[PDB]
Amino acid sequence: VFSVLLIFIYLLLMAVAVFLVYRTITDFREKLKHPVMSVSYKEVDRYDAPGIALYPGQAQLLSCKHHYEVIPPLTSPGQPGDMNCTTQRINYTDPFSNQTVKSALIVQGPREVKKRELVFLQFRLNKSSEDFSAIDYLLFSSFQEFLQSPNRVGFMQACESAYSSWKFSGGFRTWVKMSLVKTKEEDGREAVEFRQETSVVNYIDQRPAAKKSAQLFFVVFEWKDPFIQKVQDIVTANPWNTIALLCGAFLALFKAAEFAKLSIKWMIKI
Amino acid sequence: VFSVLLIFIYLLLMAVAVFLVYRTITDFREKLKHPVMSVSYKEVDRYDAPGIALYPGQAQLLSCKHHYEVIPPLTSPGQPGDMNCTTQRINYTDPFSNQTVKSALIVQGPREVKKRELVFLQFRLNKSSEDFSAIDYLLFSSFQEFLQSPNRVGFMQACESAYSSWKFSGGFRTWVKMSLVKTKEEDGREAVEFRQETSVVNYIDQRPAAKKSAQLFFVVFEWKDPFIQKVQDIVTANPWNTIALLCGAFLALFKAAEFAKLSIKWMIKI
Amino acid sequence: VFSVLLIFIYLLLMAVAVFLVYRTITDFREKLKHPVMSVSYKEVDRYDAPGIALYPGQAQLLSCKHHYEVIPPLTSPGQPGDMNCTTQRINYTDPFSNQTVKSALIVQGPREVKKRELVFLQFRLNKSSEDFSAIDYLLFSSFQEFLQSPNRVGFMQACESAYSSWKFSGGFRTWVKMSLVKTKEEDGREAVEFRQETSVVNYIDQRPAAKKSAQLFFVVFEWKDPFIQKVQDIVTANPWNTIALLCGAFLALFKAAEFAKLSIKWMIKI
Ligand SMILES: *[C@@H]1O[C@H](CO)[C@@H](O)[C@H](O)[C@H]1NC(C)=O
Ligand SMILES: *[C@@H]1O[C@H](CO)[C@@H](O)[C@H](O)[C@H]1NC(C)=O
Ligand SMILES: *[C@@H]1O[C@H](CO)[C@@H](O)[C@H](O)[C@H]1NC(C)=O
Ligand SMILES: *[C@@H]1O[C@H](CO)[C@@H](O)[C@H](O)[C@H]1NC(C)=O
Ligand SMILES: *[C@@H]1O[C@H](CO)[C@@H](O)[C@H](O)[C@H]1NC(C)=O
Ligand SMILES: *[C@@H]1O[C@H](CO)[C@@H](O)[C@H](O)[C@H]1NC(C)=O
Ligand SMILES: *[C@@H]1O[C@H](CO)[C@@H](O)[C@H](O)[C@H]1NC(C)=O
Ligand SMILES: *[C@@H]1O[C@H](CO)[C@@H](O)[C@H](O)[C@H]1NC(C)=O
Ligand SMILES: *[C@@H]1O[C@H](CO)[C@@H](O)[C@H](O)[C@H]1NC(C)=O
Ligand SMILES: *[C@@H]1O[C@H](CO)[C@@H](O)[C@H](O)[C@H]1NC(C)=O
Ligand SMILES: *[C@@H]1O[C@H](CO)[C@@H](O)[C@H](O)[C@H]1NC(C)=O
Ligand SMILES: *[C@@H]1O[C@H](CO)[C@@H](O)[C@H](O)[C@H]1NC(C)=O
């Protein structure tokens, strides 16, 4: 009889609708689980002067100077002189140890990325009773933000956790190219971080044998390129799109069901 | 006449429907071609002890010891002593050469990433007739998995292809920070790999001139951060979503066609 | 009265439709703002011979030779001999300085990635009055494309801007593993770039004290793996999908409105 076939068609269509609802729910759940990553790049005419927190310890800073695209040859390596850059010395308790006080030398970083500005730092360590001598350094976004802060100690403690710290060793020239990566936390706040490319070059020590005891650290900081990399977690689970899909599919199924009923009626009539 | 205009409207709507079907098919084909990448991060309280397969050759292991956040100064570099770590020596044929047998020293890696655990290894090579002396090392996920295996040789041969191997040279201290990246192969299997950040520091050789002939390798392994990076290939080509779009568009086109016919009839009647 | 309730229902449904249109427009605008990144990998049986533009300056090239998976020990470091590779010397004005003419030594790179082909280069610098001695190098895709070009000078000037240049220093062996990353610019053009992993190994100088003045550069170029990484910016803003969603939702809303009117009529009648 036609009635049983029509009822079976209705049941099949309702089962298809239920399965489609299940599939849409599972897809929405899956897309909530895994947001997709999108990467863009931002051109900058001038970077904001980064803060370079150096942790020399007993290593005295011989020289710190800004250069453009090239470093003039050293007049006399291992000798103090030519310190033209803004520096701030800070003492702050380590956020993790709570016992070791860190003394940091904050140096204002380069700004003209287009002009290939670099900052060159020369340190000397004299008679260190410790093999594997290296200087720690941390990079943060703004030196001015460090200056115009009410709690510089708290700012440095926050930097200890927000940013990563690297090292540069003596007997080398360490060339550091910096890059800014800003990650959107889809909450109105963006986390900025530094990615640094390091190249070490041997230092040709032409000092007298007596002066070989003191060891020299050379480090250069510049920007890799005038591109800030922005990383955003795009959500592909839109409830309105899902409900629009469901509504359209339900309307299609209802229209198909009533077309089937009309076709059955037409077959019965003729 | 109104009939010709209505038939032309029907033909235009059917052509639009066909073009929309073509566009949807092309979009589904394109989305099948290029799945989108999604990156997430996993917090870990404790890492599973990684296996560090070292290939020293004739270089004897002076020392291997676990430290926390800092390495105590060497009592006497170049002298054996203080070997507290679990190691396993293995001999296995190279999967690619089929002739060169590799002898590997498997070392259990650090676990407490939160406590900044590191493993410090000191090797000595005495009178090597080969310039550019370096030790190969490979990283795999679990030392325990290596232990509780029926074919350790086959496990090492599989590691030779699954993981990448790096080198650390003498006259340096090589600081290696490890990171785990798990890539989903959308097939029920996930491929795990190691990404390592390497920083070399000069070793200040304060040995007697006689002892300068033997060269020393210092390497440190720890974890960069308590974050495992998961990378998944999300497919954006859902056949059910595409068929729902097509059904909704077809219903819209049919309803618009019958509205147009009704409007033509209303214009004719009045 | 039922009429006021029905009119209020119609107004509510039209407001819902307007809000849904607003949401769809905002979603389309957002998806236009941020295309999603998709990463794939391409297997290669043989790479196209890359061009390695070396900038030695006064450093003479002692040796340049192709090896497979291993470098034979040096017969006599610091001595010329065994130069078997195709090289081209070029002079071109620096695109940025417009005054400094760069002299480049273009070397044909390795091809058999499967066979682990590498190219080994040995340079010597004799009595350089400049500390921090290093040689610049740039990588571009094809040496043949450099050969079969009408303006080699213009090709090199374009490479100065299209590709990135690194350095390798004396007193080391610099192991460079190359990788090709092709980014689709969604405009019919793809930008190819080189990513290089560098490992430095100490050179054990066993030369006489007289010969220690001349400094030696050792560099190796090979391919990291037979995988070319393709990065594409997929656009998730399809106007046809959006209009299909809107049409389906509008049909659903109209059908719901007429169902509501019919239900009100049925309630009034009985
Ligand atoms: C340091 O640099 C500033 C930059 O304007 C310059 O005015 C000053 O003379 C420099 N210092 C010395 C000692 O020359
Ligand atoms: C910071 O610490 C150093 C030693 O670590 C000390 O010489 C210096 O006086 C301290 N600074 C202040 C402001 O107390
Ligand atoms: C470390 O110091 C902080 C700040 O003074 C304070 O919460 C407490 O003394 C310590 N916190 C710990 C041990 O978690
Ligand atoms: C190293 O020499 C510098 C030069 O003045 C001096 O200030 C410093 O106290 C010396 N340190 C040691 C440990 O000799
Ligand atoms: C090695 O470390 C274990 C850790 O518990 C310790 O018990 C043992 O005494 C150490 N070995 C020596 C020789 O002290
Ligand atoms: C592994 O090889 C080394 C030499 O490469 C050899 O001394 C050692 O005995 C071998 N191990 C076994 C278990 O045969
Ligand atoms: C290499 O050794 C394997 C395992 O013994 C075996 O398949 C065969 O001898 C070689 N395979 C090659 C050459 O493909
Ligand atoms: C190097 O010295 C160690 C110290 O005992 C010794 O075991 C080894 O055989 C020596 N090797 C050579 C090549 O002299
Ligand atoms: C350089 O390599 C080619 C490769 O076929 C070889 O024919 C030639 O003999 C080599 N040069 C010398 C001097 O052996
Ligand atoms: C390229 O420049 C070098 C010096 O930088 C010079 O010796 C050489 O002759 C120049 N080449 C040509 C073709 O002029
Ligand atoms: C640099 O040289 C180019 C090419 O000869 C020419 O446009 C002009 O002389 C300079 N361009 C500048 C300074 O922008
Ligand atoms: C260095 O030695 C090489 C060897 O022939 C010679 O060609 C070159 O002119 C020398 N340079 C200097 C600056 O002595």
Residue numbers in the entry:
A (entry chain C), B (entry chain B), C (entry chain A): 65 to 334
Anything the authors wrote about it?
The proton-activated chloride channel ASOR (TMEM206/PAC) permeates anions across cellular membranes in response to acidification, thereby enhancing acid-induced cell death and regulating endocytosis. Most, if not all, mammalian cells express a proton-activated chloride channel in their plasma membrane and in endosomes. This channel, named the acid-sensitive outwardly rectifying (ASOR) channel or proton-activated chloride (PAC) channel, was recently found to be assembled from TMEM206 proteins. Electrophysiological studies indicate that the ion pore is closed at neutral resting pH and begins to activate at pH ~6.0, with half-maximal activation (pH50) of ~5.3 (5, 7, 10, 11), but the mechanisms for pH sensing and for the gating of the ion pore are not defined. Structural comparisons show that both ASOR and ASIC channels assemble as trimers of subunits, both channels contain two transmembrane (TM) helices per subunit, and both have a large extracellular domain (ECD) that contains a prominent core region composed primarily of β sheets.
The structure was consistent with the resting structures of the human and pufferfish channels previously determined at lower (3.5 to 3.6 Å) resolution (root mean square deviation = 0.8 Å). In the resting conformation, a trimeric bundle of tightly packed TM2 helices surrounds the axis of symmetry. The TM1 helices are found at the periphery of the TMD, where they pair with TM2 helices from the same subunit. The helices do not form an ion conduction pore in this configuration—not only is the central axis, along which the pore resides in the activated channel, too narrow for ion conduction but also the arrangement of the helices does not create an aqueous chamber that is sequestered from the lipid environment through which ions could pass. Changes within the TMD draw one’s attention to a hydrophobic region of TM2 that forms the narrowest constriction in the resting structure (amino acids 308 to 315) and dilates sufficiently for ion permeation in the activated conformation, suggesting that it operates as a variable constriction or “gate” that permits or prevents the passage of ions when open or closed. Furthermore, the reactivity patterns support the structural observation that the hydrophobic seal made by the Gly312, Leu315, and Ala316 residues of the TM2 helices in the resting structure prevents ion conduction through the channel and thereby functions as a “gate” in a manner of speaking. In the resting conformation, the residues are too far apart to interact with one another. At neutral resting pH, the acidic amino acids do not interact with one another and no ion permeation path through the membrane exists. That we do not observe modifications of the residues by MTSES at neutral pH, at which the compound would have greater reactivity for exposed cysteine residues, is an additional indication that the residues are buried in the resting conformation.
